[PDB]
């Protein structure tokens, strides 16, 4: 698919725009500094009566409220928690928007699932780098960058493509490569990856592997080593050179064993269950549950977290890790 | 479950031994160099006209035939590949093992499944570092170490635990913590780990996640990022704190997602299939298939590798990594 670099982007565009970053978390923090270094006048939008308000002042940024910053700005980047964002839009952002203002996102959930429905004459786009804030910043500071996806949901003027590229270009994403995509595509691929593989599938794989060994009479500490601790080597190797590279660098016994037993654990029915996970994301089932959980005071998530992290691999992992930081 | 440290180990024990390292690959080169800086007389034992003989000589080691090295030595650490070990023991090691000599391994496979049966009066132990050769080497140089397992299958002398711990100290493991175990427990946990979770489970999970997105019409590169490239940050998080470090550090949507959907991916049927994989290891069936692979020319393994490697995830990732950090 497509790749855009500095030569393709027009930095003079976002340079000529007042930008408001609503949020000063990991992303907010990196964007703000990189934009500033790229020549962009930036203001942080916050509750102005906040921890962050003073951290942002101390990093050199003018700080206003969410409502005042939205009013002040031409481009509004909304980097608040996915679930706070509807309330923040309705109350503090929507009421201060001019026609021609751009409203930009790090993630497409609120737009794709219609939790935020801006007026037609507003630009809606997305800049989502592929790394956490600190890396986006560090890569930028030493003349490199982190690759970004970009997307446009509302393009009333016909300048949204160039405005989201210009932004990604200012945060260093055009150094590595900017990938145009869609709000739909970004959103469902991300939620899927998290549910099926990254968060859900991985965490349960290791928990259950730990349980099978423990229930068979092996000591928990042995189990923590062969099921979680050694996973970082494997995953570092896959990150560097893919599956082929991991398989090259382990013993042939591990490699042969991986090939026989992996598709016994992840079998055809597993693949169908993943397909159902995907349908559930695409049709809004998941997002229905997501909002239900917030609108019920975050009880389900807090209950899930409380018991799901109450696992003997977490009791055993903490003892051993505490013993290894102790050198 | 005791962790053992430098204060527990008598380093003079392995310092007073002649150590043969049979095999000079990953662990071989590192064990070898670490022992030497811990004051141990080391020799490398390689097959007739081996490629690794040049590497070992250039690194300062007396290199011998396996059989000459086995004869010279008191302690013989066997780090050739698992499927090569039985034959090497019968041809070149077994004939020079004398009362009070010790045979060491870095994995319990051959001893536990009775591929190698030493005589009564030989010490049989293991020192398995929890990390890759190069990491075992560099950690030791920078004053640190990689944790080690140790075990003892045979102990005619009463010195076998002290001897293994001495060796572990000499390669840096006691700096980081040495866990006592058994041959059975290290063998089976390692194998089940590699099969169910580390190599097998993780690679099929990412591979199958990728397919699910490509068949539903999402471009292969989006799928790659969201299924594999992002896996490192997650696993790095679990490496540092635990699962709860990971859940604390991801968005509340990511955390909520994982809780609701992870158990749909890894259900109670998965748990049973894992118990099955365990049972095939414990009863020796995995071992026979490993031996069969290599008696028929290693083609099964070569074919399974090729099948994995020509998977679009491999084409796609290679493309996307070329735009590097
Ligand atoms: O543990 P791992 O398998 O993961 O380590 P590895 O990195 O595969 O290294 C295995 C080592 O064992 C050696 N080796 C293989 N067959 C041998 C034999 N018959 N006699 C002596 N040495 C032999 C290899 O040397 P070669 O380079 O001679 O195969 C190699 O240096
Ligand atoms: Mg305005
Ligand atoms: Mg809409
Ligand atoms: Mg993600
Ligand atoms: Mg190999
Ligand atoms: Mg001898
Ligand atoms: Mg292992
Ligand atoms: Mg192994
Ligand atoms: Mg959180
Ligand atoms: Mg996400």
UniProtKB/Swiss-Prot annotation, chain B:
Record: residues binding substrate: 251
Q: Which residues are involved in binding Mg(2+) 1?
A: 190, 194
Identify which cofactors the protein needs according to its UniProt entry: Mg(2+)
Family according to the record:
Belongs to the ketol-acid reductoisomerase family.
Q: Cite the binding residues for Mg(2+) 2.
A: 190, 226, 230
Which sites bind NADP(+)? 24-27, 47, 50, 52, 82-85, 133
- Which keywords appear in this protein's UniProt record, sorted alphabetically? Amino-acid biosynthesis, Branched-chain amino acid biosynthesis, Magnesium, Metal-binding, NADP, Oxidoreductase
Reactions performed catalytically: (2R)-2,3-dihydroxy-3-methylbutanoate + NADP(+) = (2S)-2-acetolactate + NADPH + H(+); (2R,3R)-2,3-dihydroxy-3-methylpentanoate + NADP(+) = (S)-2-ethyl-2-hydroxy-3-oxobutanoate + NADPH + H(+)
Give any Gene Ontology cellular component.
cytosol
This entry's comment on the bound cofactor is: Binds 2 magnesium ions per subunit.
Alphabetical list of NCBIfam families matching this protein: ilvC, PRK05479.1, PRK13403.1
The GO biological-process annotations, alphabetized, read as: isoleucine biosynthetic process; L-valine biosynthetic process
Please list the residue ranges annotated as the KARI C-terminal knotted domain.
182-325
HAMAP family hit by this protein? IlvC (MF_00435)
Instruction: Write out the function statement from the record.
Output: Involved in the biosynthesis of branched-chain amino acids (BCAA). Catalyzes an alkyl-migration followed by a ketol-acid reduction of (S)-2-acetolactate (S2AL) to yield (R)-2,3-dihydroxy-isovalerate. In the isomerase reaction, S2AL is rearranged via a Mg-dependent methyl migration to produce 3-hydroxy-3-methyl-2-ketobutyrate (HMKB). In the reductase reaction, this 2-ketoacid undergoes a metal-dependent reduction by NADPH to yield (R)-2,3-dihydroxy-isovalerate.
Q: Which SUPFAM superfamilies match?
A: 6-phosphogluconate dehydrogenase C-terminal domain-like (SSF48179), NAD(P)-binding Rossmann-fold domains (SSF51735)
Boundaries of every KARI N-terminal Rossmann domain copy: 1-181
What EC number(s) would the UniProt record show?
Answer: 1.1.1.86
| UniProt enzyme class | oxidoreductase
Presence of keyword DNA repair: no
Matching Pfam families: KARI_C, KARI_N
Question: What is the native source organism of this protein?
Answer: Corynebacterium glutamicum (strain ATCC 13032 / DSM 20300 / JCM 1318 / BCRC 11384 / CCUG 27702 / LMG 3730 / NBRC 12168 / NCIMB 10025 / NRRL B-2784 / 534)
Give the pathway annotation: Amino-acid biosynthesis; L-isoleucine biosynthesis; L-isoleucine from 2-oxobutanoate: step 2/4; Amino-acid biosynthesis; L-valine biosynthesis; L-valine from pyruvate: step 2/4
Which molecular function GO terms apply here? 2-dehydropantoate 2-reductase activity; ketol-acid reductoisomerase activity; magnesium ion binding; NADP binding
Task: Indicate whether NADP appears among the record's keywords.
Answer: yes
Active site residues according to the UniProt entry: 107
Q: What is this protein called?
A: Ketol-acid reductoisomerase (NADP(+))
């Amino acid at each position: 698919i497509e790749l855009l670099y500095d030569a393709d982007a027009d930095l003079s565009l976002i340079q000529g725009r007042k930008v408001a970053i609503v949020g000063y978390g990991s992303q907010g923090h990196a964007h703000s500094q990189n934009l500033r270094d790229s020549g962009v006048e930036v203001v942080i939008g916050l509750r102005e009566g906040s921890k962050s308000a003073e951290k942002a002042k101390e990093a050199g940024f003018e700080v206003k409220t969410t409502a005042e910053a939205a009013a002040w700005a031409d481009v509004i980047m909304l980097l608040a928690p996915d679930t706070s964002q509807a309330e923040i839009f309705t109350n503090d952002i929507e009421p201060n928007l001019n026609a021609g203002d751009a409203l930009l996102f790090g993630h497409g959930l609120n737009i794709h699932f219609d939790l935020i429905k801006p007026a037609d004459d507003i630009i809606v786009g997305m800049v989502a780098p592929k790394g956490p804030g600190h890396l986006v910043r560090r890569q930028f500071v030493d003349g490199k960058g982190v690759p970004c996806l970009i997307a446009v949901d509302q393009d009333p003027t016909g300048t949204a493509q160039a405005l989201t590229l210009s932004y990604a270009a200012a945060i260093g994403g055009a150094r590595a490569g900017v990938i145009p995509t869609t709000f739909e595509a970004e959103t469902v691929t991300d939620l899927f990856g998290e549910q099926a593989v990254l968060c859900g599938g991985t965490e349960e794989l290791v928990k259950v592997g730990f349980e099978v060994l423990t229930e068979a009479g092996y000591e928990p500490e042995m189990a923590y080593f062969e099921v979680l601790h050694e996973l970082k080597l494997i995953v570092d190797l896959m990150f560097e050179g893919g599956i082929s590279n991991m398989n090259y660098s382990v013993s042939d016994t591990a490699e042969f064993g991986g090939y026989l037993s992996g598709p016994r654990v992840i079998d055809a029915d597993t693949k169908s269950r993943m397909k159902d996970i995907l349908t559930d994301i695409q049709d809004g089932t998941f997002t229905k549950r997501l909002i239900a959980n917030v609108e019920n005071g975050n009880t389900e998530l807090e209950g899930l977290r409380a018991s799901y992290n109450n696992h003997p691999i977490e009791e055993t992992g903490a003892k051993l890790r505490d013993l290894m930081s102790w050198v």
